[PDB]
Design an enzyme around this catalytic site. Structure first.
Site, mmCIF file in Angstrom:
data_model
loop_
_atom_site.group_PDB
_atom_site.id
_atom_site.type_symbol
_atom_site.label_atom_id
_atom_site.label_comp_id
_atom_site.label_asym_id
_atom_site.label_seq_id
_atom_site.Cartn_x
_atom_site.Cartn_y
_atom_site.Cartn_z
ATOM 1 N N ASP A 158 0.857 -1.212 0.000
ATOM 2 C CA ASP A 158 0.000 0.000 0.000
ATOM 3 C C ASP A 158 0.887 1.254 0.000
ATOM 4 O O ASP A 158 0.610 2.171 0.716
ATOM 5 C CB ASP A 158 -1.001 0.018 1.155
ATOM 6 N N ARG A 162 0.031 9.078 1.067
ATOM 7 C CA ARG A 162 -0.744 9.030 2.325
ATOM 8 C C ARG A 162 -0.033 8.128 3.331
ATOM 9 O O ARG A 162 -0.172 8.376 4.538
ATOM 10 C CB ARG A 162 -2.180 8.569 2.123
ATOM 11 N N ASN A 163 0.779 7.179 2.853
ATOM 12 C CA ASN A 163 1.506 6.234 3.746
ATOM 13 C C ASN A 163 2.987 6.610 3.950
ATOM 14 O O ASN A 163 3.801 5.738 4.399
ATOM 15 C CB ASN A 163 1.260 4.801 3.267
ATOM 16 N N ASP A 176 2.985 4.619 8.469
ATOM 17 C CA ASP A 176 1.584 5.065 8.777
ATOM 18 C C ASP A 176 1.149 4.349 10.054
ATOM 19 O O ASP A 176 1.870 3.408 10.530
ATOM 20 C CB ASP A 176 0.695 4.777 7.557
#
Ligand SMILES: Cc1nccn2c(NC(=O)CN3c4ccccc4Oc4ccccc43)c(-c3ccccc3)nc12
Length: 303
Positions: A158, A162-163, A176
């Site tokens: 992933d 955002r991570n 994250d």
């Protein structure tokens, strides 16, 4: 299991006393728990009192928590978010991480985009959109974390801005707190029950065959490079989830961002070869990005 969950990898844990952790306030929240800003005492020699991010478990869980703590302890690198250890003295179970002042890299990119002026400027970053050299420094750093994970034979599954987290002096690190599906639900495709797939970041072999490798991470890194050079825009944002699956499985590539030099778009295209064994190694992608990040201004100005 869940794409981007460290225990999906099948490869000593430091303990911190509960009295040494003083919660200040919440930073974020998901289905598996919360993250607080806290003061941690007696953690590092230089600092009698330092700020940390504390992830409190919401509670199987204790056995997942134990294997997560094992794998985080094993990760030690300049571009992986630093894990200090666990508080298992009563409840809730706590994990203690370094605090990354600018939050996640998607949020940081969007607040230093093409519309940014003097007010966006600060301690760590100039006013106005991030410049070529800053965009390259961000990408280089994420690539260096991905070199380290590849060297340990870890797969992320992933990888997305955002991570990644951004700290003081624009240090960028992969990491994250397991809440990206809660905070950025639009970045996943719900496939019934609770499953949520980050399809826009996934190569064809992952969408079609459910294969995940070093080589599918390099594809995802190519998509991260596109997010960086679009200042955090969603990949395929003009498309629905099923439209994006159709585009990715049919071999469509993301278009060169306005801010992306051809040399950098060539690096994104090397990550997006349909055949996994034909994509460039993360070592090579990182060597090419680092070289550009460190290149003198006379060279970057004509790129
Ligand atoms: C429930 C859940 N669903 C998805 C992702 N979730 C994560 N996220 C990661 O495991 C991401 N991760 C990571 C993954 C793969 C390779 C290397 C990794 O390096 C890291 C370094 C520091 C922080 C995080 C990672 C967590 C979770 C658990 C405990 C602590 C922190 C985060 N829980 C989840």
């Amino acid at each position: 299991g869940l794409q981007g969950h460290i225990i999906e990898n099948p490869q000593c844990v430091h303990h911190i006393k509960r009295r040494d952790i003083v919660l200040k306030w919440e930073l974020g929240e998901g289905a598996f728990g919360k993250v607080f800003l806290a003061e941690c005492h007696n953690l590092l020699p230089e600092q009698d009192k330092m700020l940390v991010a504390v992830k409190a478990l919401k509670e199987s869980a204790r056995q997942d928590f134990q294997r997560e703590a094992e794998l985080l302890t094993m990760l030690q690198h300049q571009h992986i978010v630093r894990f200090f250890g666990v508080c298992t003295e009563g409840r809730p179970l706590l994990m203690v991480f370094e605090y990354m002042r600018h939050g996640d890299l998607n949020r940081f990119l969007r607040s230093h985009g093409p519309d940014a002026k003097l007010l966006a400027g600060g301690e760590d970053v100039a006013p106005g959109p991030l410049g070529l050299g800053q965009l390259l420094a961000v990408a280089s750093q994420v690539a260096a974390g991905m070199v380290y994970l590849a060297g340990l034979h870890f797969v992320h599954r992933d990888l997305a801005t955002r991570n990644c987290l951004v700290g003081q002096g624009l240090v960028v690190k992969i990491g994250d707190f397991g809440m990206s599906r809660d905070i950025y639900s639009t970045d996943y495709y719900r496939v019934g029950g609770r499953t949520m797939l980050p399809i826009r970041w996934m190569p064809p072999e992952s969408i079609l065959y459910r294969k995940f490798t070093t080589e599918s991470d390099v594809w995802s890194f190519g998509v991260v490079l596109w997010e960086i050079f679009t200042y955090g825009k969603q990949p395929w944002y003009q498309l629905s989830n099923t439209e994006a699956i159709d585009c990715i499985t049919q071999g469509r590539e993301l278009e060169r961002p306005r801010a992306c030099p051809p040399e950098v778009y060539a690096i994104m295209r090397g990550c997006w070869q349909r055949e996994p064994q034909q994509r460039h190694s993360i070592k090579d992608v990182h060597a090419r990005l680092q070289a550009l990040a460190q290149a003198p201004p006379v060279y970057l100005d004509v790129l």
